[PDB]
Every structure is written in structure tokens, then in C-alpha cells.
Amino acid sequence: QKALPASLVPQAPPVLTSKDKITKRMIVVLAMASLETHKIKYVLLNCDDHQGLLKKMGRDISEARPDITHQCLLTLLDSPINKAGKLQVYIQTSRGILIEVNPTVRIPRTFKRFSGLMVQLLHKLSIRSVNSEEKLLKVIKNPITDHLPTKCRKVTLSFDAPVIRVQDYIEKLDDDESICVFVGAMARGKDNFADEYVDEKVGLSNYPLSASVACSKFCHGAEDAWNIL
Amino acid sequence: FSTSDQYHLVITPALILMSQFLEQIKFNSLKRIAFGAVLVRIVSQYQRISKRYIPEVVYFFQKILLTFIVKPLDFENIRLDSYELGLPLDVDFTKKRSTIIPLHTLSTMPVDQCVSVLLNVMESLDATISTVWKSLPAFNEIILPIQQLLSAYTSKYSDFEKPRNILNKVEKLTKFTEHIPLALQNHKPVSIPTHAPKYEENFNPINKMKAQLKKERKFTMKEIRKDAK
Amino acid sequence: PVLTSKDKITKRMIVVLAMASLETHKIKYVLLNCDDHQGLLKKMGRDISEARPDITHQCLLTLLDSPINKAGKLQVYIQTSRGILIEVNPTVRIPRTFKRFSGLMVQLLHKLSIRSVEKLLKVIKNPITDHLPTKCRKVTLSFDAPVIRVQDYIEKLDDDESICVFVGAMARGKDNFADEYVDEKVGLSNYPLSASVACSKFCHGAEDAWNIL
Amino acid sequence: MLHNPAFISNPFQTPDQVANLKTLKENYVDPFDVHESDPELTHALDSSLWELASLMEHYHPNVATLAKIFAQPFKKLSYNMEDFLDWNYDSLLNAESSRKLKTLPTLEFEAFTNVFDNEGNVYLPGVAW
Amino acid sequence: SLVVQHILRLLNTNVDGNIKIVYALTTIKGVGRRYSNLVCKKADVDLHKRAGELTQEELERIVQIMQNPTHYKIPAWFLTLANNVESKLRDDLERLK
């Protein structure tokens, strides 16, 4: 008995933006990204490629891995939640740089070209599309909280925290609200990098989870919750 | 040549040229109807696998069946071209009469010949119902006019068995087929728009010629001053 | 228990990285890459589009790092494009960086063996069917196929059996690589899924279906 | 009429929703009346275009392609009618000959011993020399 | 029941039927506000209409007005060295030393 919509032609769901706060959504903050540049040409510092120089900088080589950050964005962006226009990625560089990742961007699959973008992005402060129509990777002013939705839930991934079901968690949360996950791309470290902003910390599994695995596990349950499919 | 092709050099012009005859020819003489009867058989085998729908086969069948019962005043939507070909009531329709139409008889050309052409046309109808129309979503609509015609055949000729078996067969197909509202504009949801990033592979933190002039001209201007100084 | 191809009885998850482009090229032998070696592949005559062992690394990385692997309920096979079959031991800990990933595959393909002092990665004789469990269901990922809930799919399947998924690591190609072995084709999402994403989504369903958690 | 959304089956729909859907499928009847002469009373709007679905199996390839448009999104706002009005059997045949792209002729691997039936393998059963 | 009166293509240019005729034609390259006003006045299309509401003959008249502007008396107004410098300056530098 209900009247059909006039236009059944598919329309891509709106590209969500930080200026927009009302829409219910899923923010993932890849906290502590090891993204640093340095002239040799500026090259993204890596744990394996650049060991001697980072020693000259005095920073430990263990935590100099942008590969982990690269992997999390690949699965997050290629997740079918991103295809539904319901997710953005924020990157909190260990240095203290907050980066907004447009859902439309395509980071290159190869890590070498990914590193080219990060030295590129960090220096101009932005990235523009090939057709010059939208800014895909833009650095944004700290604190991260201002950019988040006005009504939103904040959680962190903690191994020591109680194990929960992501599907049950999102179902019991409200609708107008949104959920923030502060995922540690940090290889090994204490889980307090988002303690100041976040209200509670939850565990996703009894066993340790990689940042790429944990975020992918979180989002897949979210689609089961909202039926994104 | 391969008849079971969507497009072919010789089949498609042949089928288009051939479908014209099943519709354009008057079929107002026993020679003409028998020619159409064989024409039906070839198109039936041209789609022995492809199983495609030829509307002219429906039109040709409706008129020829009605042509041999001439009108009963109940089918005013069918265009007849001859009303003097009505079969007589005295026809036995129980003797074993050959349904094969020799092409050499076509040149020669009575009741037995008229009845035989009816069977070969009639036998082709069962095969088309059994194979082609059964699969089509509009089977009930396609078979509805034909079903009414055969009801006249059974009522007029009780002994005649061929329409009754096919009427029983037609009844069986309609019972099993579930005539549900068609659903086609269900589309896979489209993803968010998609753009690649623009950048330089090796990032620099006539154009080159101009800069070289600017850099060293300043060097020139500086050093002349201290020398003159 | 560390699961092995010898044992067929146990219900297990076999994820098949079919048509994997991990090829060794000597000017010394090095794993071919779509970007590193473009002119060399042109001389070899193969398209550089389908010259990406990168896609295979993340799939192994997400499969091996999934909780299901930690529970001892998953195995991975890699059917190389040329026709080389590789069994991936669940206990293996493949390198996180791609450069070190490439250095292993040249060792694996030439030595046919990577041993630690059980063999972690082993080249094995085709066909895949004999290695698979005796009672086993076979499916692939097909974008055109109907979309099905993985959790509902695994639940309705029996217990003694096993399910195989032939995941296509290609950047692009027709989904007929495993048509000979499989009995049906299933889609996982309306939107296209990367090989890493799709199996990561798939393995998540298996964890929920069996309560691996 | 082209599509009734109430009859779509969704993977997420609960088992009770599945059962209700089957009952709706069973009790449907086509309400379009062909003999009513007043077009405002034929109850056509409650019906559907199964006939158009058949035409996408039409023997002619291009005709089948045109019918397939109803299965495609309605991006096009309108179709120039004058480009479709004056077509005849002769025009179609002439258009077939004047084809922009030329294809290779194909052959049938299947072998028929006799092209016509008698009065092993017969191409045209029921027709004899 | 029978009463017979969104986009249109003019000059191989898509103009939205929603916009006014004069400012819908402004989008055309080489067509300004004043020129579109003059064309509408010449075509006897009263300027208030939307592009969608224009009938066929009116669009034909507009096209004929534009394509033959002189025919309708439309006013006429409407219708290496850097390397050489661097080499010279290098010579100056060398001579200064």
C-alpha cells in the first residue's frame, strides 16, 4: 500500500564528513601511527629500510613500522562498511599529527607507493584527487574530540579488558549515537594512548589480535548489527 | 550453421526473413498452410537449444487452429484470411493418419490432407508448449488464447484426442507454475564514489630554468655587494 | 593439535589462495612484482597487471593472524598461477614486511622446502582434491553469485564435514579458476570484496558459528 | 507494476517474515481484466508486466536488448520515439546486411544423417522429401 | 481528462529545465545574460518562462536567432631565451672572479 520512491536508480550514499555530526557512524582512530619523514629525498622512516638513521635520531627501531598502519587502512577502506558510506579513519601519528582519511580515497596496495603518499601528505599538509575534485587525505587540528560527532561512544582495544561481542555491543548502543574505536597500530605498547578521551576499554578476543585483524573483526560484526551486508 | 547463437550471419537474417512468412503470408490455402506448418518446424529446431520466444509462432498457431473450426463467434481478436477451410463434422479423427507433410504434395494441392496438416501443426504446438512457453514468465497469458481454441476442438470433436491431452498438459503446467508479481528493479547497492590520489613519486620539499636563474642571481647580487663593499 | 593434510577426519577450515602470482625471476632469482619488475616481465611476455604477489601476502597475514588459526581450526593452501600448490602450516609466522615475504618465496620455490631447526611451507603434488578432507564441501567467492550469510551457511552445514573456500588472489580475472573442483558458487557481499577482506569477513563468520571467539 | 517491492526476499528477514512471504505468494491472483472497456476499472495498476519479461527472450538480439532495459536502471529520461516508429521486416533485413561490425560464420559440431524425415539422426522430424 | 501543454539539450549543451530561459541559456558558452535576454526578446519568448516550459517552435526560433545572428541584425558587439640569460650571467660571474 506504500507509495514507491520516484527514482529507483542507485545513488551512492553521501560521503560522510567531519563537518557532519548527526549521522550515526563508525569512527576508527588508528592511534600511534609511526609516520615520520627525513631527507636522505624525504623518505618515510621504516623499521627495516632505515635502521642507522633512526638510531642517529635516537628513536627505537622497534616502533618504526608504517606497514601496520598501511595494513589497517587497506582492510578498513576495502571493508564493505566503507562501501556503504558509514565509516571514516582517523590517524593519530605518534608525533602528534591527526590525519583525516576521506572514505573515498584509494591508498595504493603496494607499501612502497603508500610510503610515497605519506611523505607527500605530511609535507604539503594535504592530498588532492587525480581529477582535482576533492581532498582525500587532509591533516586536521588537534584535539581529535572536536572532529568527532557530538553524541558518540568511545572505546579502545585492550587485551586485558573483558572480552565482548561486537555485534551485541553495537546492538545495545543507541541509534543517533556513533561509536569510536581507538585501535593501536603500535606494535607493542601500553594501552593508554586514548585513555584521556575514551570512557571505557573493551576486549575483542581472549587471544592477542593484530591491529589489522582486530579492526576488521570489529567492522564485520558492525555490519551484522546494522545489516550493511 | 550453428542455430543456437544470439547473433549469426545467416541464421538471423534467415530467422527474420522466416518470421516474416509466419506472419505476413495469408495462409488462406491448404498448400499455404502446409508451407507454414513446415516453416514452424524449422524455427522450432533453430531454437532447439536457445529456446527463444518467437511471437509469430503464437500468431500463426492461433489463426490456423481457428481456420479449421470456422467463426464460432467467440474469438473476435484473431484475424482470419479464409473462412472456407473449416473441417467437416463427419471427419472421424480416430483413423491413423500420417502427420508427415511431403513437400512434393505441396505442388499437387482433400479432407484427409486438411486433417494431416492440422495434426503436424497441432503436434508442433505441444512441443512449443512443453519446451518454450513453459519457461516463459507469461506462459498463462501466451497459452490463454490457445487454450480457448482447443476447448472448441474438444467440444466440437469429442473423439479427437490430441487437444484434450495437450489441454490436460496445459492444465498441469499452470498448476505447478507460481504466477508471482515480477521483480526486476532490485539492484545491488552501489558503493561510495571512488578516486585515486594525486602526488609525486619522488617528492621535492622552463620552470627549473627559471628557479636556477633566481637562486644564483641572488647569489650574484649578494657577492657583488660584498666585493664592492 | 597442529592440523595437517594427513588428518582428514577433523572439521577444519581450508582457505585456498588460488592462482597466486609468486614467481621467481633471475636476471639471481627474485620474486616478481608488478612495480619492481616491469621491463623484465615484458621480456618474459606476461602481463604486469597479474604480477602481484602482494595480494597473496595480506591474505595469508589476515588468515594466519585470525583467531580461528589460533584455535587450531584453519589451514591455508596456495595454488600458484603456473600450477604450483603450496600448503601453509598453521604454525608458520610469515614476515609482516613484504620484502622479507618475497625473500622466503624464492627460497621456498627453489628449495621446495622451508624447514625450521615439521616443515612450515611445503610445495605439494596436485590436485588439491586428494589433500582436502574426505567429506568436504567446496565453494568459491563469486561476485555474481547470490549473497549468503556466512554464519547461516556454516551453521546449516553438517559437523563431521568441512568447508573449502577457493579465494581468488587476482587483481582481476574470471571466477572459473576452481570451477572443476567445486560444486557451487556463493557470493559474500553485494559490493565487491578484496581477497583479504572477503576471507577476513568469512573467517569471522566461522569464529561466530562455532563460538571460537 | 514492473516491480512490487513487497515480494522481494531479503537475507536478513526473520523466519516469520519468510513464512508470511510464502503465504502472500500463494494467495496472489492477477486482477487485470481484459474485457473491461473503461480503462479506469481494468485494475491494471495492481498487475505486473510479465509479458515484457518474456520479450527479453525474444529471438532477435537487438529486440531482446531493448526489452532488457526494464531490468536496468531508468537513467535515461526519455527515448526518441521517431527512431523506433517506421521499422519494417524489410528494414530489419537491410539493417542486418548493413552491419557496422562483421563476425565470422560459425558451424555446428552436431551431425544429422538426414536433413528430412523418411516416409539415423534426422534434422527435421515430421517433414519428408 | 485530456489536457496537453526537467532538462533539455540545446547547442549540444544540457540546460536544466528548472532554470529561467535567459539564465538557463547563460550556461551556454558564448551566451551572456544580456545576449540571452536579446535572443529571448527576438524569439518572442517572454523572458519569465523556465527552460522546460518552452515549446518546440520557441526553441527552434531561439536556435535560428543564434545560428544566424547577422541575419536577424544582432549587434556586432554581442557576436631557450632563459638559457641564454643564464649563460650570459654565468659569463658575468666568471669575469667577476
Binding site: - | - | R52, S194 | E82, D86 | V63
Partner: peptide, 27 residues
């Protein structure tokens, strides 16, 4: 009549995405 409306509809006629693991174009 066809020629008259053939002129009409010329002005009605209007002349004239990565997926999966597809990478951005090289250069």
C-alpha cells in the same frame, strides 16, 4: 509528420571506478 517531429527531438536527445584489489594507475 516524421520529419517535423524528427526536428523536435534532436533538442530532446542529449549526446553522451576501481573495484576489489585494483590498484591506482602506474606512471
Amino acid at each position: 509528420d516524421k520529419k517535423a517531429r524528427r526536428r523536435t527531438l534532436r533538442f530532446y536527445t542529449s549526446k553522451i571506478r576501481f573495484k576489489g584489489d585494483d590498484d591506482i594507475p602506474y606512471k
